[PDB]
Design a protein around this ligand. Structure first.
Ligand SMILES: *[C@@H]1O[C@H](CO)[C@@H](O[C@@H]2O[C@H](CO)[C@@H](O)[C@H](O)[C@H]2NC(C)=O)[C@H](O)[C@H]1NC(C)=O
Ligand SMILES: *[C@@H]1O[C@H](CO)[C@@H](O)[C@H](O)[C@H]1NC(C)=O
Lengths: 400, 400, 400, 400, 400
């Protein structure tokens, strides 16, 4: 239309995009800043980078871009592209992107009275410290710092508007708690100039269903299965094989899990503590199984049971465990032969009884060690998990 | 040619690319929007990104770019590059690309009467929520939202044309069902201005042959092989070794499969349910094998069989399982010697029979547990799979 | 030089880069298209993308860029950069790159009579469907489609020149067969305008030495080693352990191989068929070994051999397998004692013979199952491989 | 404001951005250079690239960009974008980025008297040689070299300002020691022109908690568990199985650890030395276990114990190890029969004693080898770790 | 300064950046080309791409950019940015980068007499065929081809200057041998125009310490450990378990090593040959162990030793191996009873001797196979390694 063509011709006359559009040069220009969170794409634990989808919101009043609607009927708003009008240089201070300005520069919508709007979308990759002390029950507070790169408070004073979460898309791995923010003023040393900024901090809570189903349950199941060695009779030769195979499975699960948590060194993760406890328990179980095996295959002709060990185990433990311990010249010549055979059989029988007593001693230490290790593992696996804060809330939310 | 040179010189005179080309400034400009789906490249389950090959289609009528063919014989169409004529700022709202405008800006083809065409190709990376509750039998509905970034309904009203799938290239992993779309109007709070848009939703069905051949069949084969422990005689010492080796193979297959599904926590995947069932069954089988082994190697001098257990197993189970349970002074001196030897042999024989009865008890509990576990595994592996909807359609399409 | 400076000043006067340089506006402009294949970089099986190194070749006659050599002695050719002269907008239709125009825009070399040459190099990432039905013996036909994005046949008619392979660099993984191409005309619905294009299809054959050395040979070696269980005496307790360990090795090799082939679901790959056959054979071998073991440790006091089974195995199989089956009052008191001892020994001997006959039955079923499984595995591993076409040519080329 | 508009109009008149702004052409221009370290993002060991977050600081005095504040009240500073004023071409010499200039060009802030400030942020990817001789106890010195690309000392002399670490964000994997720097002058061959530069070297110390918890502790635990073979009685058949299973676990841990350290060949890493020692110890333990087993199952009818071996082991080792070694015609016919039986039993008994002596010899070599291997492993695992410098400081910092 | 401002104003008057700056249009322009190698970043074996850090060096004499120093005191050199003066279009012909021009365009330094210098840095990704026939002892010759894209020899004749390696940074994985180069002329078919170019070929030698420490030593150690099966007594039941466990470890090491070498099919790598030899040796050892086991557990009631086998083994091998092979009516009734018992014992004793002879035969074949396999493995592992050329030089450089 000729009206809007004339308006466009008149507006850009003697216009400098390098000039702050204010009526009085000694007064600042008010700029309103806000956010519109859309999607939390990736929370990188290893490299400490949070990737989000954000719609920036800026608004300010211009002095030169005004006109009378009556003179130009039918046209109410005009649009200007990049590099033709002045716009604030608001930048994310703590960015972690190769292109520091990750905003797709769109048009600028203008009032009939100078008010401007600017909503550049973009995917931001900030840098926030991530704590995994209570992983996978952690709650993080990542920050987004925004401010003018070169303008001062006496020239450009930012104002904060409450963040928008209306169009937020829920994420299946992180539960958003809230995104508060507040305006802050930072004075300098030389000069009384304030330097306003708007900082938005994101609070999100990890959803624990996936890890609780794929790591805690299977690992505790293998740990429980490792206790069966104490219920296996020593006559079969599968005790050490079974124990070492559970150890191998635990090592494989360690290999599977090693790639998730980062390489931090500020605090030992809860998953690391629990896995160390489990592997130590399994190793101790293997040691006990070896001791029991060396008790069972004890040589009957070796040293006899010491009185202290006998009275300690076979009496006291049996009392506590409620188990019962099992239990003519030719005529002379043949007489000596049968006597020798009978005495040989008698010696064999007494040696067999001597071996049986050691077998019973091994069988009675086995159940004691079973009870001890069962109590140890249940207590450890309860305490380690219940130590972490907000565990009850996490299991109330992600399981019910 | 001099004719087209003159036409080009005349057309761009007093032309502003920042002006909406309409005859009346108070009336909107009609713009037709459409799509031409070409290829579904990648469906990223973990990061929830769908990558497609798309040819956008836009068309509108211009008012200033008209001429008489008689005045310029031989020339019917003209082409303009980027930044020389006004074009709509149609953008994908829900994009997930670093460059928000992933369209390769091509030329604009012009009528002899102002009609314009614009087909910018590009590879789009949208963000759509992906459900894996019925994985790998899922059907997803990803959306593509298109609309003007700054223009209003009173100025630019979009119109929807049916999508084109003529040049669609079939994908070996996803089966396209259809790509419908409809125009929608969104009114604002202040003002009665409609804000039209065109949303295209893609419906695709996963092809299940690959997963059904590489995951379900091998895993169920190992699960079936794990049942052989109940057919292995207890005299050989390979029962625990075999069971724990099947457990190790299952753990390795878990490690192989862990990397496919995402880390969501909204619903337990069907593959997760089935794998948990299989591993629980294998663990219970190992427990039963340990119990059977401790029954087989029971000490003959220990506690006798309780009457309740004897009558429950050896009579009732044998009835049900249809198996039969197996079954001169020197003269005095030598007489006592041979009597002692004979009595020793008699005691050994009765102890052997006592042990044989326990061996039979173990052999008869073994088959009962075999039957129970076989029924359990077949019922579980049938119910878990048949629970998912459209399973019959999936196996009718991807297997016949 | 002043001559070339004057020529450059004169040439660009009143020149519009948006005008088709033709003498008559109603006639088309002939443009010759060709290719110069240089290197096949990557053939992506999973995402179906072929990456090549290409030198495009374009040539056309210009009408405004002509001069007399006598007027400008010493200068024969001139060069123009991007955006200063008109060049055809030839684009790869089926591209799979974020930047749809993957050509590095170089200069344009000009005749003294208007003829132009343009050779923009670039690395192209097209999208071609890849078949892995006969993997790793496949032969693929990937296509490259080239044509003007907006110009018509009445204005710009493409002409095809034979492709150049003089500077082709041989690839160690793919053997190039040839790169033919032909010109095609596509008429529209409204109008009799042809729309010419040039399509180049690449035919390449996979080199099979690497896969044939790293997958087929080792896997068949483990499959052959799995047959040794039938030559192992049952007295040793390593049969089940050996079989399950070969199964574990096969599972590990499956894990190694799983990452190569794509996730397609249109056809079962030959490698998948062969691996399924091998794993099924190994599982059946384990089942047979369990059956043999349960035959060997059969209780001598259990049910006797059925007559049918005895005559079927011990007679017929031995006939076929050519193996031979192995084979004073005190005086009265001592008389009864020695009689009892002798009768006990006699019963023990007959029970031992009864057990020996079952041991022989197991030993004779073992060799029969060995022969059956050996024939099965050799026949399967020959037929599966020889089923694929061009197998003889592949082994003649990549092995001799 | 009209004042700042007039000032902007006056400043850029007859201004050439290609001219060095100095009053006297024969004198150099002083430029101050500094740094503001913000974050150490990634220390790439394999490809030797250090990625940091840096805010460059430059300052210099301009001669043409001056004005009187009284003539232009209310305006004190002006800002200029890229390409409108002259700025130094300071570049990182030893960069490892595809875009050699990884700085986001921001505005330039100007005094009222010509002084300029320029703080372009960016993420830098330098290339510094990384030493892993003492990994994971290493301390690296990566360098950042900055200097003008084309200007000389007689025209542009750099000056160094101390680095800023006020806004440094601590990293969980690297502990920053300090970032010193100094100015250096490099004369040329032809000409007495100095060429100043500023080099900043970063000193950082690796935090060892993660590796010390996930690699050293578990590996030494498996190494200790491998010693249990010497406490396992030889009667059970799990010695070789246990040893080879610990070997398999060690191989799996090698596979897990192989991907961390780079592929350098200048020095053997400490972790490589320690792992080689551990695997050699385990292999030697397996060899000793095989020797002990072949001693235990020695045939009683074979060669007798040599006198030298007997006196060396059974006497001296028992002295040192303090273990005790265990310990009528018919009448004639029956007489000969019982005599034959008794002599058979006597020969069996003496053969059993002969075998028992070899069993004791194996049992006594077992404990000697246990002691030797325990001393070897503890000494090796102490010396290898304590060899590295700053080990005490590392364990004092990262563990207390 | 006003002098340099005036000089800049005068220089760019009537200057065309599209004109070759020569005094005579019919004469060529001499351009000197050189290189400054800085760092070899990555040598990609799989995709055949060599990434380097390069400083290009170009120099030529300009005719229009000259001035008198007396007229402009104090200014000796001027700098021009991209796109304001003519510069040669030297491009790397065999590039493998998406951006074909990987040079960061810097300024151009100018004499007071027209001489120009241009040093654009950049990271280049060329494409050179990589041979791995002798991996990891290979020496590669990658090439870098440079030449003008459109200018001819009659207009632009390149001249080669020797490469610079003063600032070369040593690489821990590749040892640079040298970077020679030579100028070459390529005539065309139509015309006698030479087309000069400068080609630089890089010769580098791989450092073998890392591979020689992590692959050859551990693999040969496992291969040596696999030979212990022949020193293990057959009475213990760990022979097959040990052999199959070494096989499993070898398979795991194959999985670890599979990802290093590329997927070429032109030649079998030395590492592939050696690994195939090792796995074949281990498989043959397992086969021999099975044969020995089936000899040891031979049934005493089966077929007797054939005379040929007896004389071949028990005599000849024992000769060669120097081992010795081990070694009143009631009165009648009791007489018959004791006679029967004695005859039973005699038959048992002779059967035991018959079994002992087979046990000795197995024990004597075991050591023969041990010697054979030891000789085989040492000879193979020496010959395969020593076959490769420059092996002695590699072990002299990377080990001493
Ligand atoms: C314009 O360029 C073309 C080739 O690049 C030249 O035309 C060729 O000339 C030769 C000799 O007459 C013929 O054999 C060819 O058939 C021609 N090819 C084509 C495509 O026409 C021509 O020489 C150049 N013109 C000038 C003045 O140099
Ligand atoms: C600008 O502000 C100052 C004080 O705030 C005042 O003295 C001056 O008059 C103002 N100038 C204009 C044009 O309003």
């Amino acid at each position: 239309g000729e009206f809007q063509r004339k308006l466009y011709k008149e507006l850009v006359k003697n216009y400098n995009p390098l000039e702050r559009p204010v009526a009085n040069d000694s007064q600042p220009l008010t700029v309103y800043f806000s956010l519109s969170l859309l999607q939390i794409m990736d929370v990188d634990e290893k490299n400490q980078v949070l990737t989000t989808n954000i719609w920036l919101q800026m608004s300010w009043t211009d002095h030169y871009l005004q006109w009378n609607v009556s003179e130009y009927p039918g046209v109410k708003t005009v649009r200007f592209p990049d590099g033709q009008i002045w716009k604030p240089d608001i930048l994310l201070y703590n960015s972690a992107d190769e292109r520091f300005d990750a905003t797709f520069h769109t048009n600028v919508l203008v009032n009939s009275s100078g008010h401007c709007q600017y909503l550049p979308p973009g995917i931001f990759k900030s840098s926030c410290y991530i704590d995994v002390r209570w992983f996978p029950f952690d709650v993080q507070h990542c920050k987004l710092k925004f401010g003018s790169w070169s303008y001062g408070g006496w020239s450009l004073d930012l104002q904060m508007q409450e963040a928008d979460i209306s169009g937020y898309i829920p994420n299946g791995e992180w539960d958003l708690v809230g995104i508060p923010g507040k305006r802050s003023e930072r004075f300098y040393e030389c000069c009384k100039e304030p330097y306003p900024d708007v900082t938005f901090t994101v609070t999100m809570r990890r959803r624990t269903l996936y890890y609780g189903l794929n790591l805690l349950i299977p690992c505790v199941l293998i740990s429980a299965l490792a206790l069966l060695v104490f219920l296996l009779p020593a006559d079969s030769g599968e005790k050490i094989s079974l124990g070492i195979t559970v150890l191998l499975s635990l090592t494989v699960f360690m290999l599977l899990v090693a790639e998730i948590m980062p390489a931090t060194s500020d605090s030992v993760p809860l998953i690391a503590q629990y896995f160390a406890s489990t592997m130590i328990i399994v190793g101790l179980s293997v040691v006990v199984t070896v001791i029991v095996l060396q008790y069972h295959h004890h040589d009957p002709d070796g040293g006899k049971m010491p009185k202290w060990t006998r009275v300690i185990l076979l009496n006291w433990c049996a009392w506590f465990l409620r188990m019962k311990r099992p239990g003519d010249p030719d005529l002379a010549k043949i007489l000596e032969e049968v006597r020798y055979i009978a005495n040989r059989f008698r010696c064999q029988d007494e040696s067999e009884a001597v071996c049986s007593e050691w077998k019973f001693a091994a069988c009675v230490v086995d159940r004691l060690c079973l009870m001890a290790f069962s109590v140890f593992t249940i207590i450890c696996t309860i305490g380690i998990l219940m130590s972490a804060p907000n565990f009850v809330e996490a299991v109330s939310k992600d399981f019910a």
